[PDB]
Write a protein that binds this ligand. Structure first.
Ligand SMILES: [Cl-]
Length: 230
């Protein structure tokens, strides 16, 4: 299947990403608390629903939340300010709370179920958000004696996400709270990594790092009544 791209709402960020976030891939935004990761996720959940000419993939979204970050009223606001029917937009975002790391992995079976049900419809799933990828793994596997198991369980979760991305031709977008002001996670991955931070004058700065097929660079964007914009 053709690799599809979902607009972020920011022309500059889309340019940095080679046109938008990709289907058949896991995009991982990382950065400090307050860097805009959840705002980007919410905006993508709306943008995916739009036609291609408007930055979407005529799709629906599923949003897995681990730290009570999902805000339906924020989706409604983004939808309304983009000229859409907020009730319709909300109906196209399937919410699931993950209570712990084992449940978080269980929810991928539910995701898979929903994706096959919608597959040959005029509105298939095109986006799975996991906000956040790592929080329950970090809270449940603490200290040296649990580190190996944390890594194995997270690796298994990421493998399952890649399977969903590739089997159902969806974009997977995950968030990760990290403090690395150099903008690099040491651990190697098969995610497309974007480092987010606060910039000057209310803006956010995204830095694309370690992509095989896109050059490293930065883009500036704002958080607004429309979600993310330049
Ligand atoms: Cl990976």
């Amino acid at each position: 299947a053709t690799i599809g791209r979902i607009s972020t709402g920011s022309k500059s960020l889309d340019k940095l990403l080679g046109g938008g976030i990709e289907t058949q891939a896991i995009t991982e935004v990382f950065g400090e608390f307050g860097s805009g990761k959840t705002q980007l996720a919410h905006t993508l959940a709306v943008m995916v629903q739009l036609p291609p000419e408007e930055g979407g993939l005529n799709g629906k979204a599923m949003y897995i939340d681990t730290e009570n970050t999902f805000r339906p009223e924020r989706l409604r606001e983004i939808a309304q300010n983009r000229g859409l029917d907020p009730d319709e937009v909300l109906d196209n975002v399937a919410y699931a709370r993950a209570f712990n790391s084992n449940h978080q992995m269980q929810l991928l079976y539910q995701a898979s179920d929903m994706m096959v049900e919608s597959l040959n419809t005029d509105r298939p799933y095109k986006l799975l958000i996991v906000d956040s990828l790592t929080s329950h793994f970090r809270s449940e596997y603490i200290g040296r004696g649990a580190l190996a198991e944390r890594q194995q369980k997270l690796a298994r979760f990421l493998r399952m996400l890649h399977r969903l991305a590739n089997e159902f031709d969806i974009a997977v977008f995950v968030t990760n709270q990290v403090q690395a002001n150099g903008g690099h996670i040491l651990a190697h991955s098969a995610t497309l990594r974007v480092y987010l931070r606060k910039g000057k004058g209310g803006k956010r700065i995204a830095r694309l790092i370690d992509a095989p097929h896109l050059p490293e660079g930065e883009a500036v964007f704002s958080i607004t009544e429309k979600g993310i914009e330049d």
